[PDB]
Amino acid sequence: LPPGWEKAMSRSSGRVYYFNHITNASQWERPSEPARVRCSHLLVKHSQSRRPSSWRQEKITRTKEEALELINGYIQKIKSGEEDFESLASQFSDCSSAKARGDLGAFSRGQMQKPFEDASFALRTGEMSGPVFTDSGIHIILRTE
Ligand SMILES: COc1ccccc1-c1ccc(C(=O)O)o1
């Protein structure tokens, strides 16, 4: 299995699934290192965020647990097809890259907080992460290239 992926048992179904410990992705199908990748993201900040402020809200007061909740709702809607990533990111991301549908352009290793970098480099093109925690808050990452 590609970097970070492991077999687990579903504790509802007892069906086998795969989870990734670097990106926090999880899925039923069996899964499948570039100099540069391109990613978008949807950030949800909380009161223990490095900077508890964003373009959406001068004072961010939601708890880390409430942030994780919002993130999990957005992941549910994205995975169900009910909203797309770009649209939730534009409305809801606490990063001002919300204005570009969450797009950050291409970067290589060396540039981002590590947990974000590692998640982005472990994603496959097209692939979306689970909740990824950094000092800025809780990220959903989409690898676009
Ligand atoms: C693309 O943005 C990030 C990637 C990794 C770690 C943090 C960030 C980020 C974007 C905006 C902010 C912040 O307001 O702290 O933090």
Instruction: For the chain, give every domain's residue range.
Output: 1-31, 36-145
Question: What's at 32, amino acid-wise?
Answer: S
Q: Which residues pair with 40 in a beta bridge?
A: 103, 142
Catalytic residue among 40, 93, 95, 97: 95
State how far the Cα of 129 lies from the Cα of 127, in Å rounded to an integer.
Answer: 7
Compute the chain's Rg from CA coordinates: 15
Cα 80 to the chain's mean position, in Å?
16
Method of determination used here = X-ray
Resolution of the structure in the document, Å:
2.0
State how far the Cα of 44 lies from the Cα of 81, in Å rounded to an integer.
Answer: 20
List helix spans (H) across 29-109: 64-79, 85-92
- Residue of 110, 90, 109 whose CA lies nearest to 43: 90
Q: Which two tokens stand for residue 99?
A: 């204005």
For tokens 């490095």, name the residue.
Answer: 50
The best mutation among 38, 58, 134 to test binding of ligand 1, ranked by most ligand atoms within 8 Å of the C-beta, falls on 134
Which CATH code fits 1-31? Answer: 2.20.70.10
95 Cα–ligand 1 center, Å:
7
* Ligand 1 nearest atom to the CA of residue 50, by list position: 15
111 Cα–ligand 1 center, Å:
11
Give nearest CA residue, ligand 1 atom 4.
Answer: 112
User: Is 139 a residue of the active site?
Assistant: yes
Give nearest CA residue, ligand 1 atom 7.
Answer: 136
First to last CA, the chain: 21
Residues present in the chain in total: 145
H or E element in which residue 131 lies: none
- Contact, 87 vs 102, CB < 8 A? no
Question: What's at 5, amino acid-wise?
Answer: W
State how far the Cα of 105 lies from the Cα of 31, in Å rounded to an integer.
Answer: 25
Q: Which two tokens stand for residue 136?
A: 């800025």
Q: Which CATH architecture has domain 36-145?
A: Roll (3.10)
109 burial via Cβ count (<10 Å: 0-12, 13-18, 19+): middle
For tokens 């570009």, name the residue.
Answer: 100
- On the CB side of 10, CA atoms within 13 Å amount to 10
H or E element in which residue 59 lies: none
User: Is 46 a residue of the active site?
Assistant: no
The pocket around ligand 1, CB under 6 angstroms, is made up of 41, 43, 50-51, 95, 104, 112-113, 116, 134, 136
CB within 8 A of 65, min separation 6: which ones? none
Cα 58 to the chain's mean position, in Å?
23
For tokens 């797009």, name the residue.
Answer: 103
